[PDB]
């Protein structure tokens, strides 16, 4: 059935509950942003009126054909009336159109879900900061110590500075990037545009970028893949048979990969820094693993949390095992006391 973390005491709404059915007593559906655990069970089928950013109401026609009638996208950093009931949504500095919801009771409760998010001080100036959030629904995939990753800025610079050498000193080298789902579009973006090529992709994913809002997309991305020398590939074809594979169907264009796999976390980042990184390697195939994560670290969310200092924290991510649970719990407390909320 669906858990009390997805849904919104005081209203009649939910937020990321497409798979339960229909909720009893839900009268309006949020979905923060166009990863599929959270859309899961929405199609051209459903029903019920759908809030969310103006991207993620582009991919939900485009992608899963929902009809238009029940997309109902509002406008960021704006203050919206939904079913009596004041919500703004912020940019959650996840993927494309990934957003915050922020909920206005009408008892003077005022309740943030971040969505999925990666926490930055850049938040601190946003409309959070004109009022008190009294209860946090708060992604905590990475709610423990041992997750550090770099900023998104020092590993795009690693990626850009490794695939203009290895091309400047062959110019017969295919760059590849594995992709699974929107984000991360800067790691080939950023390749593509110091390397002076498009990227080449599938039809699908091409019409999926084509939802984005991104500027200028037409110049950086297309469909034909002989004309490009950075290619996506779904990320199950980034291994060492996967890249053999596609290597020959380029016809000898080619004669060596580097590929890239933009993880989350690695236990690697325990101990290397990005500087440190090395491909594993076969032959002409280079595979490397960059810790490019669209979640906050531990110290980000520790940061934006003690700022916001809310009443009550309800975890939505590792919530399955008591363990977790009990872990997740003594931060919160530990940084409560630190903080002196
Ligand atoms: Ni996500």
Redesign the pocket.
């Known amino acids: 059935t669906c858990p009390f973390y997805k849904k919104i005491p005081g209203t009649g709404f939910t937020v990321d509950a497409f798979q339960y059915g229909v909720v009893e007593g839900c009268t309006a559906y949020f979905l ?2 166009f ?1 599929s ?2 859309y899961a069970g929405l199609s051209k089928h459903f029903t019920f009126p759908v809030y969310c950013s103006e991207i993620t109401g582009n991919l939900l026609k485009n992608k899963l054909h929902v009809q238009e009638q029940y997309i109902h996208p509002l406008p960021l950093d704006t203050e919206c009336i939904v079913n009596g009931v004041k919500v703004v949504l912020l940019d959650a500095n ?2 494309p159109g ?1 957003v915050m919801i922020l909920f206005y009771l009408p008892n003077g409760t005022v309740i943030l879900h971040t ?2 998010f990666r926490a930055d001080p850049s938040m601190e100036r946003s409309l959070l900061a004109d009022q008190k959030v009294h209860m946090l629904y708060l992604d905590t995939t990475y709610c423990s110590p041992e997750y550090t990753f770099p900023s998104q800025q020092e590993v795009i610079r690693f990626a850009i500075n490794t695939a203009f050498e290895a091309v400047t000193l062959n110019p017969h080298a295919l760059v590849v990037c594995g992709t699974y ?1 929107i ?1 991360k579009e800067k790691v080939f973006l950023a390749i593509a545009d110091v390397l002076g090529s498009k990227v080449g992709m599938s039809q699908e994913k091409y019409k999926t970028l084509q939802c984005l809002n991104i500027p200028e997309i037409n110049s950086l991305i297309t469909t034909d893949m002989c004309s490009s020398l950075v290619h996506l590939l779904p990320m199950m074809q980034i291994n060492f048979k996967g890249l053999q594979s596609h290597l020959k169907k380029c016809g000898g264009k080619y004669n060596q990969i580097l590929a890239f796999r933009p993880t989350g976390w690695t236990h690697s980042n325990k101990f290397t820094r990005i500087a440190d990184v090395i491909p594993q390697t076969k032959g002409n195939i280079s595979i490397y693993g960059i810790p490019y994560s ?2 906050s670290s531990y110290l980000e969310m520790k940061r934006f949390v003690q700022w916001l200092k809310p009443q009550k924290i309800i975890p939505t991510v590792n919530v399955g095992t008591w363990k977790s649970r009990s872990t997740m719990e003594k931060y919160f407390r530990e940084w409560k006391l630190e903080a002196g909320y």
Do not use: I, N, R
Request: aromatic content about 0%; overall charge negative; charged content about 20%.
């Open positions: 923060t942003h990863h655990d959270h996840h993927c990934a969505g999925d789902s984000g669209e979640h």
